[PDB]
Design an enzyme around this catalytic site. Structure first.
Site, PDB file in Angstrom:
ATOM      1  N   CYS B 122      -5.069  -9.085  -4.330  1.00  0.00           N
ATOM      2  CA  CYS B 122      -3.943  -9.546  -3.526  1.00  0.00           C
ATOM      3  C   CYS B 122      -3.744  -8.742  -2.241  1.00  0.00           C
ATOM      4  CB  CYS B 122      -2.638  -9.564  -4.347  1.00  0.00           C
ATOM      5  SG  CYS B 122      -2.478  -8.364  -5.690  1.00  0.00           S
ATOM      6  N   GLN B 149       4.037  -2.581  -2.720  1.00  0.00           N
ATOM      7  CA  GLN B 149       3.706  -3.697  -3.594  1.00  0.00           C
ATOM      8  C   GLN B 149       4.783  -4.249  -4.519  1.00  0.00           C
ATOM      9  OE1 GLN B 149      -0.437  -3.621  -5.236  1.00  0.00           O
ATOM     10  NE2 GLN B 149      -0.837  -1.982  -3.745  1.00  0.00           N
ATOM     11  N   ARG B 256       4.127   0.917  -5.711  1.00  0.00           N
ATOM     12  CA  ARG B 256       4.977  -0.151  -6.216  1.00  0.00           C
ATOM     13  C   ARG B 256       6.438   0.097  -5.822  1.00  0.00           C
ATOM     14  NH1 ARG B 256       1.771  -3.010 -10.332  1.00  0.00           N
ATOM     15  NH2 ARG B 256       1.596  -4.452  -8.563  1.00  0.00           N
ATOM     16  N   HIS B 263       3.923  -8.479  -0.965  1.00  0.00           N
ATOM     17  CA  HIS B 263       3.377  -7.141  -0.772  1.00  0.00           C
ATOM     18  C   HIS B 263       3.471  -6.896   0.725  1.00  0.00           C
ATOM     19  CE1 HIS B 263       2.037  -7.000  -4.769  1.00  0.00           C
ATOM     20  NE2 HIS B 263       0.756  -7.283  -4.621  1.00  0.00           N
TER      21      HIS B 263
END
Lengths: 357, 357
Positions: B122, B149, B256, B263
């Site tokens: 991704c 993310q 994260r 993202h």
């Protein structure tokens, strides 16, 4: 004992200072005088009252400083001005304090007769406290930064707005979440819908923070394209280290995320010489008693290198240390630090302790 | 018409694919066959049933793939395998698809007789969709990344956990927040206390995400110190562009944060030649119809360059473009993209459309 006046001691930054000072019994070695701007202690606008003080510590703000400062020094006042605000940081007769990092600059300044000391940018000082060792050995050629900045850096109301935003996002799917069999996409559609609603409170950030992020902090500087926040990286790092002649390039992007009071930073550090990762760590770790090197291990990283862990503490962890694919002189690093402590009140508290020693 | 079997179409990624396919009326040009792993349509484990299909599209997962894939091709099956999982991405007989970026690689592969196509990482595809133009001109020497993310990349349960975490944090100070005169530090102490409580739900991330962040995604690769997520940057970017011989260095830290499905990424791009910022933008903007260049303006950046804006859309904005203090060949860039679309289902949906054309 020195006669020290305090201004803005009731604000958020001021309150952290008052608390830390109590904890360390700093009041035992000085004579405190508290001021206020209210017309409901002395008036913070009474120059003659301030003129009698040996030292002035302000967490009031730049507007206050720009107003009162020039007047007071205009009376011939020969005392010290300790400020948390950014207003004077870039003055020739001022010094940006971060004593664990630039004590030598501070001492020489005191001897040179400097009378104005200012705490520096939160992200800059949190960076230096983390990787100061590298700078001390002149091992840093340049540094690219990407920040994950907390709401406290913007203000108390910004913190509350962030919290309200988080509340509403969940409330929008409180029941669905309880149903272990509910649809993830449906929940998603609803939370995103609320985030975008007219009544989603975004007055302070000008955009949603909770459940999102804002890649822009402070005003834009047409000259370089940086925001004032990103500009302070190059300017303040070097003035603190006293290298305005041979400026070390420090640049990157400053981004706001949904954290309360810890700023985190991802570093792409270009070392001037290829050194073994283990020697880099030792150097990092021995610079000061607060920095903390976190092993490149998952469980330890999840327990140590996060806002959740460092919030409210003086610990400055740095981890995820390793060489980057671009070459053995390219170091990766990630750090987390409390914005209100080393990023604000602590440097102020410590320069004060020295001045009344 | 081609006979296409679908597996894992009920999962989160699968569901986005089904939805996008309906929206574009992709089902009108193919004969769909739906499978299931349940013993409550055909069985996803029936090789003979799968063997009859011209194409297989799986969003089921790596375990499924590693199990069924080798068996089916072992029967002599000469059909196509379209997978969203990472399992086969790094196979010699496989190609990582991102057609708006590497159509030429895809076409040549089809002619070469390749029968396995896999969507890529991704963050990697969201990066390429954003700054593909630079790669197309061989203007990129290397790229340092720092990611922000979303939870969706980890899974549906991780998204729910993030939401629950946000809820509890606010609930811990719901009344205090309503009191406009309440203490900010007190509220802070309480939210941080709950974040740290034994009952604060962190089973899925292994640490708090809401109100914090986690600088670690996936397993550690002892060999380089990178996590598998960070490793995919170098490996996948080049296999997609077809440059495994002359690999362009792509590295950084994958972190994260509390976002649902977009993202974001901060880039420090080293250009091979000093070009004027405006020429860089035009190049960026003309590579594809989805990328969107956001002017280095505050209000526009706050309205355009955020998860809040791009979530659920195919738009790939990139902004905060400017030269970095380290030199005119150093470009700063920040992008935001939806993880479930170009980061997952879209590339899959588009390679399918080509295969049944």
């Amino acid at each position: 004992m020195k006669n020290v006046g305090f201004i803005g001691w009731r604000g958020m930054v001021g309150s952290v200072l008052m608390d830390r000072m109590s904890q360390e019994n700093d009041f035992e070695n000085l004579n405190p005088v508290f001021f206020t701007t209210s017309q409901a202690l002395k008036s913070a606008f009474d120059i003659e009252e301030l003129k009698k003080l040996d030292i002035i510590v302000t967490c009031q703000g730049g507007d206050y400083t720009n107003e009162v400062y020039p007047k007071l020094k205009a009376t011939g006042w020969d005392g010290y001005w300790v400020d948390a605000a950014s207003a004077l940081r870039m003055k020739d007769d001022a010094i940006i304090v971060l004593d664990p990092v630039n004590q030598h600059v501070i001492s020489e300044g005191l001897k040179k007769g400097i009378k104005t000391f200012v705490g520096g940018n939160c992200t800059v000082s949190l960076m230096l406290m983390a990787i100061g060792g590298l700078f001390e050995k002149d091992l840093v050629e340049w540094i690219s930064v990407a920040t994950y900045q907390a709401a406290s850096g913007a203000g108390a109301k910004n913190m509350r707005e962030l919290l309200s935003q988080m509340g509403l996002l969940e409330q929008a799917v409180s029941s669905e979440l309880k149903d272990p069999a509910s649809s993830i996409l449906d929940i998603e559609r609803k939370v995103t819908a609320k985030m975008r609603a007219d009544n989603f409170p975004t007055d302070n950030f000008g955009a949603a923070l909770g459940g999102s992020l804002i890649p822009w902090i402070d005003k834009l500087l047409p000259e370089t394209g940086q925001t004032k926040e990103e500009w302070k990286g190059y300017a303040e790092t070097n003035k603190i280290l006293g290298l305005s002649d041979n400026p070390i390039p420090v640049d990157g992007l400053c981004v706001r995320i949904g954290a309360l009071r810890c700023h985190s930073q991802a570093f792409t550090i270009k070392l001037k010489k290829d050194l073994p990762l283990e020697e880099i760590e030792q150097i990092i770790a021995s610079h000061n008693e607060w920095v903390k090197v976190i092993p490149n291990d998952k469980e330890i990283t999840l327990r140590e290198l996060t806002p959740a862990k460092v919030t409210g503490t003086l610990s400055v962890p740095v981890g995820r240390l390793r060489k980057l694919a671009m070459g053995p002189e390219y170091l990766a690093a990630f750090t987390v630090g409390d914005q209100l402590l080393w990023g604000a009140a602590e440097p102020v508290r410590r320069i004060l302790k020295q001045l009344v020693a």
